[PDB]
Every structure is written in structure tokens, then in C-alpha cells.
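the seven lines:
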Amino acid sequence: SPKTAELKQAITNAINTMFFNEVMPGGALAPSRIIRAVAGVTGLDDFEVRFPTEIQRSENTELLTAGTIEWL
Amino acid sequence: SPPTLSSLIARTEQNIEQRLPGSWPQAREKTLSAIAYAQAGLAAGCHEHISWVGRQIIPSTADEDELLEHCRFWGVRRKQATAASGPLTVTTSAATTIPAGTRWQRADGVVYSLADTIVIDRAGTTEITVTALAAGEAGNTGENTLLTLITPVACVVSDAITVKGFSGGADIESAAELLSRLEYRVQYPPFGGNQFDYVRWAREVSGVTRAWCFPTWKGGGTVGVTFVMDNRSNIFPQPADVERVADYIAGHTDPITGLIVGQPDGVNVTVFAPKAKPVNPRIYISPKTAELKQAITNAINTMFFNEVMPGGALAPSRIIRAVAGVTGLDDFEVRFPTEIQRSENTELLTAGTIEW
Amino acid sequence: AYSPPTLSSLIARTEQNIEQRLPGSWPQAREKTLSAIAYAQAGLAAGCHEHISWVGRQIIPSTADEDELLEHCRFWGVRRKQATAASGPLTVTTSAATTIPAGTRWQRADGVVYSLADTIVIDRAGTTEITVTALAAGEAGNTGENTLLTLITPVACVVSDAITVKGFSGGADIESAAELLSRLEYRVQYPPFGGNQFDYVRWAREVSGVTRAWCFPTWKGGGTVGVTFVMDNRSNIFPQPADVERVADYIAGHTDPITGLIVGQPDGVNVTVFAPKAKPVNPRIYISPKTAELKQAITNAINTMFFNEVMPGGALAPSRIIRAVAGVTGLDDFEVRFPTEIQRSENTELLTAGTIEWL
Amino acid sequence: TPWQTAFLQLLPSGLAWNKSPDSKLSALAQAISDVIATAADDARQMLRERFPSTSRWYLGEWESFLGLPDCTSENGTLSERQRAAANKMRMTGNLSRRFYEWLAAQYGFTVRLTDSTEGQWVTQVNIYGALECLLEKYKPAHQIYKFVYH
Amino acid sequence: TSAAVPAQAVAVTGSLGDTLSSVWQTVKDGTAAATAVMEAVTGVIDDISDAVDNLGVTQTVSGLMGSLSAMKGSVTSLINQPAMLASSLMGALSGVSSLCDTRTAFSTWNRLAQRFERRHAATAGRQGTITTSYNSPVAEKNIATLNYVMLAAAQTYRAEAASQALTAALDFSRRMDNAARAPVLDAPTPPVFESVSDIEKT
Amino acid sequence: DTSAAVPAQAVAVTGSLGDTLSSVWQTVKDGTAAATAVMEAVTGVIDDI
Amino acid sequence: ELSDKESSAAFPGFTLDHSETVYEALVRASRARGVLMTSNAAGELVFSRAASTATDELVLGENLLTLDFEEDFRDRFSEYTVKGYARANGAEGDDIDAKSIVSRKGTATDSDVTRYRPMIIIADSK
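prediction for all of em together
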């Protein structure tokens, strides 16, 4: 809801560290973890995660990585 | 922001080198280095005392005694502790008069004295009221606390059993609570019937925890204050509580100056309790456990206590933050509260029954 | 921190600091040239520690020196009170009924000048009492009983003599530190006084002269309140339109005498100040022993009862008048004849005792 | 410098010690005493810091204790922050128009509370030559304010 | 002398109590004189209670506050009996004195002296007035004597507190040694009575 | 007595260090990297002791 | 001489051991009452009261030929606790229970002695 540079940077860093912590090759990612990471910012008013509503999966040789986040 | 010990050492050594040309005080185990370190230590001591002299200017960072002095100067008054009173059931043999001063002692040693003389002729067990002497939180006791008599009295049996427990004991407020009261006083300045003044007036009375004031409630001359209570079970107000809060706002005496202050005569307040507006959320959690149920209920309740007021709106993102704050669970999808909820000022939203 | 280190401890620790960082070990008895430097450094440290302690004693206003307390008062808004003069009566006699100029001066033997700042014309040769205020600010200009004063500049048909049967009073010097601290704490701790039915009474009564006040809330419906004030010190008990305007102005705005901030009526409500209207009642009491003293006592008792138990919009039973008459106890037989019904009135009319007959 | 002179005076007095203004004892004494001079200046600073009207380092604590950051505190000017803190710390008064004009003058503005035009409760504020929000926050509970600029 | 001050303070308080009870007269229950006397006594008790409440920020003063509350509640009984009134008032003053340390005694007694002096001056400045003619003489006497006695007791207690503060300061000065000794590594009065001009002003 | 002046100072030093730790410690309410790393540090200290 | 309200409290019962001297009996009573018994300057018995006002001054410089200051702590304890038997003869025998007859206690604590140092005293009478 607030579109400011420091909020975008904080959300990006939160997502990056959430990927760093509990993302390993051959793992499963749900929208729950991303929503939790975004909510744990204490600098927002309203938000909603829309795209990765489905469970993301990959094999052993593949590793999940956060790409380019749109709108922020 | 005092200078560090290394900075003081470097400054002193630089000064020594500047004042004595061709000198290098930083040499190991030398007289100039020893003198520089001694002076750095003395300067660090002075700086630490400067830091202690500071940090007492504001009561927020002040020590205990200076905080008490600041409270005394600003007018906040400590409230003394209370005694413990209770009903004592005493058995009697014949007609007798119990004088004011008789003492009954518990098994521990705490004594309770009668403050007014009484006369009895029933030749059976009667009930009196008795107050303690310690005047502290140890005064109050349990349900049935057998206790004996210290001062012998004619025609009365020494032992006595109390069926209703002693209550009313308390303790003097701590410096933390005094600081909280002083901080509230400084942060919300007092006017004559201001929008913050009505809130603080409705909060000054016992029981009330939170209160809000809507200026120009129904017209150009009426203002409306609504209060809630949480220390209870109904967590809401009753007509008697509303009437007594309105009476307190209408008139009460100021402890400081001894005069009476309150709402202005011309305006009307018309206190009214809020009306519950439950909201039922649908939340799915893959692990099921009563501990997780209690944790999520507590999280939502604390969310509502923190960010919900009468006349305010609640976005679903607040519920999603409360649901994501729980550590144990793995999935926290919500289904029901997709849209925003709003209510009029007379009704306050409440987290109703939680659907899982 | 609190309890800064003693000079002995500073000396010992500085000497140890110099001794430890050197290769050798000093003997038990010696007079080294580093010991003097250590003692000097310790003295410097003890001096600054004392300076810092004095600075730290100046934060709270309860322990500050007089200068720092004055700085605190300057910040808050409390102003110190200067020394006040002393005033009193001068009994001077004139020969041919002259006019005393505006700034005549008297002198005391000690050498303190008194002055009269007013003009007074004398009608006939006799002793007159005039208010005179001293020209010395301090307490020294404060005489006692029967002190004699003399003129400085001769005035025609005025004998240079002043008796001062009642001594001069006044003569207060500057305020003390404790008094100033108490005034500052009053200013800090006093609460705001929003317009209340009790507060209007005080605001009306604070004006000099006004002695009784009454407040009627919700007069003529909600949103406007009425007040009434009466001054019995003057010969005419009821006030005048000028006094009504003055009291209304004081109600609208004034500076609080105890707190430097500005107080006044609420902006919303409408305050109306009206002078009460007399509705006299004539007792016409019959008394068996007829003399001046008994008439005076009965009139005084009636006036006292009226002053105590009579308010605008109130009823007055004749039983109160009967009791007031009976309380004199200097009579033999008395009778009340005119007031036989329960007297009553509205808000704007105030009961008062009229001209009493037969006494 | 007086601090070097005080240090020199603290030294023993005799024919041996040379305290002339060009000697090595004085040259060393100046460098030794400069640190305590700076510390004593820092300690003297606590006199001014005592008030929020002139504090510099403790402005953060003075604002945190007062709950200062709000509409009447201006953007970044340290003088404006000091004035806002020193005005809120000693903030008590009634609802009288006179007090409201005095308050609006205390913040640097100058307004006149004139009579109503359309009703009774509504009161008109004439601003001649932050204020809007400050007055809407500290306004009387029952009354309503209208604003006219000149 | 310094050791003979407390005896004189005790004698002064005793004499004031004796004169108060002997002078106090009884009045009727329903008249306005009783109302005025009750109001004045309640105001005096209110002043003492404010002093105790200021004292109680650091200590526990609940017992004395309860005693003062009982005395305020039972005023009408005390007005009729003069000896009990004076005895209770002096006991309350001594109870206030029993809580003050050597640091706060002078300040608290100074505050009480100012508070009582305000009332005494206000009630003594109005000697002859057309409103003063309405008040009953017996009530006026019973109020003036009480005001004077309270003021005098407060001032005497303040003087004794000042002497005790001087004694404490001199003991603090005495504590330090005076003999020549070597330093050793260590390992473990109100401010108005320190300066020399402040003592002169006091 | 320099032999008995060491433990007396050591007691005060330990008390001051404990008070400083208690004052400066800040609670982290999250369950993320911060909380788990604090857990790792505390459990490492216990392991050494 | 005492004007106390508790020193004048009457004895619920006081018996005399036979062949007891008057001094023994009166000292036994005065010890329980807390009073000290003395002889007057005119031969009377006196239950004396300690003085209150300082009347004289003794200094080392002016009016002393010899001083002697002994300060021994071989007897002063920290906590004196007295234990005894309650009253049950006669009227109180219909009221007092069995346990409180034997269970009685009293305490007086000293602050001059800093170590444990207690002392228990068997009472002298009921």
C-alpha cells in the first residue's frame, strides 16, 4: 500500500533472507513462507501476495532462487 | 557520546608529541607512554561521571531516586499500600463484649485486630469484620484459613475459622508505574474538557482500561466518550458502570489543589458503552493441536486489543499478519475475511468465534 | 557516577598506573620525580570531579543554587517578586485650609524619604489623615507607633509635623529561594480549570470589591449560563452597570494570579452577567423596650440572617425573621406583624431587608 | 591557558622545579591538562542541555519522552524541533479564545479568534500574514473551527 | 547552646497546647459559627495531610494518613472537647516530625510554615469590615488562636530542624581524619546549610 | 591487605557485567534467522561451560 | 512514678512462694512488668523513670581526672525469644484450647550484633 524505496528494499531483503534460510535444492516452496516474510516487516499498512499461490517444487539438481519482484 | 579510551590515549600522545618536538610517546614501556595512559584513565573517569550527570535530566532514563524526585516535582503522587480486611467467624460461649483491640493471629504470625467494639449475647458462632496490621500483599489469604486468638477474652473460644478469604491487600506502586503515569501526564496535556482530557478522565476511575472520545458526537454541542473494560469476563460496560463514569466526569475533586474539576456545565457528554460486532474468520492450519488453537486465538485477540477501536476499519492484512506471527504452524490460509470490515462509532469490532 | 572517587584513591591509582608500565620496580622509601606529577594529575582529576558534581547538582530545581533556580524560573515563566514599599496614615494639621500638591515629601530622622502621590484640598483647619507610601523599597522604610515626621519643602499654612498614630505597614524585601521554588511548583502542578459552575463563582469573586457570587447553569436552556455578583462593602449593596461590565471582562479574560498562563470561560457556552434586582421586605417589628441600642441590635441580627440565608431565586419564611429577632435576648416582648406569608422570588430578584418600622 | 597554570600550581614549590612559561615542565603541562580542559567544557555543557529549548544531544530523548514527533513539529529544522518540544513540555491552559490566540502566537503565528458567521459553536480564526493541524488537535471538544486567511 | 534546644522546643509545644485548650470555647451545633470552625479545622488537617502525602513518595505513611483521615472524619466530636483537639493536633505534628530525616526536615517544615502563614495573614488582614461585623466573635477568637498556635508550632519545629541540620553537617566534616598518612588502593545536610552566605540569610 | 582486595573487586566486576548484560539485552520476538542465531550462540556458550 | 497504660495492667493472678523475701517477690514481678525497682534518697521504694532532659556536661578537657571506657560484646545477642505456658487456671480454662496452652512465644531483635547469635529464655510465670 505505501510505495516507497526503503519499504521496497526492506521487503526485498526479507525475501532474500527467507530464501537463504529454508530453501534447499529439492525443496517445496508455498505462498505461506513468502507471505510470512513480507508480513514480518513492521513498516506496512496493507499487502497481498498474488503470483506464487501454488506450491513450487524442484528436483535435486535445481535450487529455488528469488528473481525479480514486480511493483517493488 | 563520550570519547573512547583509545581516542583519549591517541589524543594525549598526539598532544605530547606536538608540545615536545622530536618526541615519540608511543614507544613501548617508556615514561611518556605511562604518563599518557594515566592521564587517559583520569579523563575517562571524568567522562564517565559526565555521562552519569547526564541521563538524569529526563525521567525516562533517570535512576530510581531521581525518578521519584521528578515525580514529586511534576505532581504525580504515589499511592500507599492497603490493609487486608475480611469476615471472621468467631464462636462464643455466653454473652460478652469484644473490645476494639483484640488480636487474632494466623498460623504464620500475621495478626488482625478489631477496630470497633461489639457486643453479643447469642451464645453461638457470630461473624465480625477484621482488618490486618501489616498493610501489604501478604495480608490477603485463602478460602478457609484457621487462626487463633492472641489476647484472651472472657467467654470466647480462642480458635476461629474464616470461611470467606481475606482480600484487599496490595502494595505501593513501583517506580515503573510512577514513570508510566508521569509519561502519560506529560504526553497528553490537560485542558478543560479536551478530547484527550475526556479520555484521561474516563480512565482515571477504577476498572476502566481504555476509553475513546468523539468530539461533536451528534451535533455542535455534544461530545461522546465510550469506555471498555478487559480485566473482567464480559469485557464491556454495565449501566451502573456507565452511570458512575458519567458521574466522575461530571464532578470529582483534584488531589493536588483540593478543588473540584470536571466537564464544563453547558455541554453534555452522554456516556454510552459500545456494542459488540463479532467477525468470524475461516483459517486452515495443516497441523492440528489445541496448543496451536490457543496460540492463534491469543494472537488474534492481542491484534484486536492493539489495532481495533470503535468506529475504525480492519483490513484482512492485519488478520494475515496475526495468523503469520504464530511460529508452530505451517500453513495459515484465510478464506472468510476477504473484504474490509467497518462499523459505526457506537459499535466496536470483536474477534468472535474462530472457525477452523 | 555517584560518590566520585576520593583524592587519596586517585593518587594511589595514578601512582600505580605510572609504576606498572615501567621496567623496574621502585623502592619502598624514595622521592621520585614522577610521584609529584602523579599527585598533580590526581589533584586535577579531583578538581574536575568536584566541578562535574556541582554541575550535576543543578539539574533538578530542588537543589539548584539561587542563580540556576532563577534560570529555571526564567524558562518556566515564573517571575520573581521585587521589594515592596510601606504605606500608612499621616495625621497632619493645616492652618488656613490649603491644597497639598501632588508630590509633597516628608523626611524621617534616619534619612529615609516618604512621599504623597495625590492631591488633597483641606476645607478647614484641623487634623487630617492621608495615605503616604515610602520611597525606600526595602524593609527599612517601615516605622512604628507614634513616629514623628517632618516636611522637606515648606508649604504655606502647614506645620512641619506628622504624628502617625497608626504605624506604617508593608516593607517586604525580595522573595527567598524557598518561596520562589514553591511558586514555581504551584505553577507546574496546578490543573487546568475548565468553565464550571463552581469556577465561575471564584472568577467573579476574585475581582476586588465583589464579595458574593452565584452561578445558575442551563439558564434559559442548555448552552448558556447566568451569574450574579453583589458587593456589600459599599453603602449601596447592589452593583452598577460599570461593575457588571468589569466583571464580565474579567470572566472573559484574565491572567491567573497563581499561574502565569491565561484562563477564561469556555468558547462554546454563552455567559451572561446580570445585576440582581432588589425586592425589599419590610418587617415592621414591635418591641416593648424602645431604645437605640435594641433597635441597632435587632437591625444587625436581621441583616446578618439576610446575609447568611438569602440567595437569588430563594424563599424566606417568616420563622427565620422571628428567630433572628428573638436571638437578641435584650428584649421583654416582641411581635412580628407584617411578614406572615412565605416570601419568595425568581432568579433575577434578590430578597433584602427594607426600612424597618417602629425601630 | 588557566588549566596549565593550575597544574603547575599543584606541583611542588622549590628551587629545583622550573615553572617558567618557556620551560619543559610548562610545555608538558599544557599537553597533559588539555584533555581535562575538554572534559570540563563537556561537563559545563550539561547546564544548557538541561532544557529542551536549547538541548542538542538529548533532543532525541526529549522528543521520545514527550511523544513529540507530530504535526506541530516542523520538517527538519533543529530550532523548530526545539521550539516544539519546549512548547509541548509546558503546555497547560483553558479553552478561552484569548488563550488560543496566545497559544497560536507562542508558535510564531498570529491569529485572531473572531465571532461566528453562520452558527454559534463554529468559530472563525483569521490568520494574518502546521497551525491547522495543531488547532484541530487541541481544539475544544464541543466547538468547531473555521479558517480564513488574510 | 546546642544541647538545650530540644528541651525548649518541647516546652514551647507544651505551652502552645496548654494555651490552645484553655482558650478554646464551645459553640452550638447548628449555628454558622460551628460551620466556620469546622471548615477551618478541616483546612488545617488538609494542610497537614498534604505535607504527609508529599512525604510519602519515598516512605510508607499509611498509618499517619489513616489517623489524619479519622481525625478529619470525627471533627464535630473534637470541636466540643477542647483538650482532645489540641492534644491530637500536637500529636499529629509530632507524627509528621517523626517521618522527616535530617535531609528533608527543614524543607518540609518550611513548606508547612509558609502554608500556615498564608492562612494566618489572610485571616488577620481583615480586622474591621462590614462583612466581618456579621461573624460571631467567639468563632473568630477560636479561629485566630488556632491559626496562631499552628503557625508557632511549625516555626519552632523548623528552627529545631535547622539546628539539627547544622549538627549533622559538622559531624560530616568531623568524619574525615586530619593526620598525615599515605594513600592506599581502595577495593570495596541540605544544600542551604553548606555555604556561608546561605547561613546568614537563613 | 592486597591478597584480600582482589576477590572484593572481582565480585563487583562480575555484578556490573551481569547488570550490563541484563540492561543491554533486547528481546527478539520473531522466529527467523535472528531467533535461531541467538539460540545457536547461547547453546554454544553452554557447550563451552 | 511511671504514667504508662501497660505497666499498670493488673496481674490476672500472682502467688507468693513461701519463705520468699520482699525483694525477691517484687523483683520477680517487676522483671515481668519491665519496670526496674530502686530505693529513694529518703528510704522509700521507687519504681523509677529514666530522665529525659540533658542537665550536665562531662568533657575530657575541662572537668575529668580519669576516664575508663569498656565496650565488650561477650553477652549481647541478636534475637531473644521467650517461651512459656499460657493462662488456664479458672475462667480462662473454659476458653483456652489445649495446644495454645503450651504454644506461646515472644521475640525481641537487636541490630548491633550482625552474626546469628540467638538466645531462648524460659519464662518466669504465666
